[PDB]
């Protein structure tokens, strides 16, 4: 009979030289550290008002993971990772009503390595204004999940697509959505 | 493209009945495979796969190393649980409820937290336990869930349909009725 | 309150 789980998850990937450090509570991200700006980014602004975390520490663990990756790469005789393509899903935040603010959620799940290209498309054209996303979230099977969001005003005329590129896919994957 | 090599580490804190019982795990991964771990219920590192034996023997041979990890349930888990308890374990957000037709009658429950929830369908005061299809609990990745519970029926005049949602955030059952 | 991280051990060379 389990109740709660807190996870401090981290990773480092070569040749990309990309690392990640974050805390997770029952599946949701509490925060992660932006390695570049060297600061803590809270998942919800409110969180950062009651707690804090020494961001620099994340860099210390990451530096050890780099050294560890090299050590493990050699131990395994340079055995590369096997690409696992993502499963992609598009849905809205809530019931859609014409002319009422909503949010399209593009869910990328069960994939590795932690590298993807995600682009929102409205009537075939790329959309960036107002979009946001999460870092790579850990899965209990050690693959990853990721969320991309697009706030929008529903119309009978607009059509949307979440395009996802991953080395595990022979070709880009497109998940479609339109006001039914 | 060129081969990728991934290293992951997961420090997990499993809490049961608050902090009365706590289990700590220091997990190491090469790509998607866990090769070595320390389980606080075991007391020392153990190889998960042959690849991790070197690390188990190495780390286990250092009294000070094991000493620190054995005290992690206290110096790490319990401390962190207390830090964010007010905005995580105690987080509460109301279920937004909307009932619309689709032949189906859909009850969309949105924006709630925590995740455990009870959604039941009623007709003229009598619960409909057959012909109810739920999409399951859907995580929005922003500390809010959503779920759609459909009732397979042919809406008719004179008939009263009610969706009843029970959730920790609400003091008493939330009901929304729909009529054709 | 302040969150504290857990250390990541360096593997055996």
């Amino acid at each position, epitope marked *: 009979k389990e109740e709660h789980v807190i996870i401090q998850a981290e990773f480092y990937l070569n040749p990309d030289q990309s690392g990640e450090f974050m805390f997770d509570f029952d599946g949701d991200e509490i925060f992660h550290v932006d390695m570049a700006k060297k600061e803590t980014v809270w998942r919800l602004e409110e969180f950062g008002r009651f707690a804090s975390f020494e961001a620099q520490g994340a860099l*210390a663990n990451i530096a050890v993971d780099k050294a560890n990756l090299e050590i493990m790469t050699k131990r395994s005789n340079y055995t590369p990772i096997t690409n696992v393509p993502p499963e992609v899903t598009v849905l809205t935040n809530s019931p859609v009503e014409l002319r009422e603010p909503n949010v399209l959620i593009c869910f990328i799940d069960k994939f590795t390595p932690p590298v993807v290209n995600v682009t929102w498309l409205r009537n075939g054209k790329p959309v960036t204004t107002g979009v946001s996303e999460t870092v790579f979230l850990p899965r209990e099977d050690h693959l990853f999940r990721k969320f991309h969001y697009l706030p929008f005003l529903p119309s009978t005329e607009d059509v949307y697509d979440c395009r996802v590129e991953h080395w595990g896919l022979d070709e880009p994957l497109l998940k479609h959505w339109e006001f039914d | 493209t060129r081969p990728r090599f991934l290293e992951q580490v997961k420090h997990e804190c499993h809490f049961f009945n608050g902090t009365e019982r706590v289990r700590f795990l220091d997990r190491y991964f090469y790509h998607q495979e866990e090769y070595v771990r320390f389980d606080s219920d075991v007391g020392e590192y153990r190889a998960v796969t042959e690849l991790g034996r070197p690390d188990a023997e190495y780390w286990n041979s250092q009294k000070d190393l094991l000493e*620190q990890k054995r*005290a992690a349930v206290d110096t790490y888990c319990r*401390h962190n649980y207390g830090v964010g308890e007010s905005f995580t374990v105690q987080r509460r957000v109301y279920p937004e409820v909307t009932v619309y037709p689709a032949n189906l009658l859909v009850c969309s429950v949105n924006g709630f937290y925590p995740g455990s929830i009870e959604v039941r369908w009623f007709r003229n005061g009598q619960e409909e336990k057959t012909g109810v299809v739920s999409t399951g609990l859907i995580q929005n990745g922003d500390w809010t869930f959503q779920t759609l519970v459909m009732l397979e029926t042919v809406p008719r005049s004179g008939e009263v349909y009610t969706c009843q949602v029970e959730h920790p955030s609400v003091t008493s059952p939330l009901t929304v009725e729909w009529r054709a | *309150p*302040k969150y504290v991280k857990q250390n*990541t051990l360096k593997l055996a060379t």
Partner: T-cell receptor
Amino acid sequence: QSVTQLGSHVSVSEGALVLLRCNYSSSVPPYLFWYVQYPNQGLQLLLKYTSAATLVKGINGFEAEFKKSETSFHLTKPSAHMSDAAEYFCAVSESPFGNEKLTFGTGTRLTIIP
Amino acid sequence: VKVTQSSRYLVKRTGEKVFLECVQDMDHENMFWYRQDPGLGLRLIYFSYDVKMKEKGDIPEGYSVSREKKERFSLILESASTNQTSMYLCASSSTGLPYGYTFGSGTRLTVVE
């Protein structure tokens, strides 16, 4: 985090009681260290508090008790020996092994009067 | 397990640009620079947890560092001033290691006009 060592210079007659003060401030699980610098030598770790035990016994006959309530970690020794003349430094850290930045006290110079 | 500092002693003139070296061959990820002065103990000037990483300590003013290679952590005095006359201590460690600081032999630097 912070540490303070009330008493920069302390004189003790030999055979007497040695007491060097160390107080700390920490909003996270504390890990304290006592370093000693004998003349013409580099800092040596005397003992440390890892939370494994409240009473820590160190080398060279020294002892220290972690008192969460008083937020203290005083270094003490029953009988002062002429070879204890040195400078003692108290330090605090957020890491369990003292491998990430340590914050040092101002230090105390211990003089033994024969 | 040794941390070696370039010089044991140095004399430099005000305004000059001074370089204090620190190198360790243990593949430690963490290196720090502290200055030691009577009645002030050890004060953290700058520290680094990885290659190219620089973090201001508690008294960075007047100094700067450089961590281009993991093995070396250089402390730099842009325009040396007399109040920078002190005993500089280098230390190295790894967050992934079951023990702490490894101090260097120190570097006595006196800045004269």
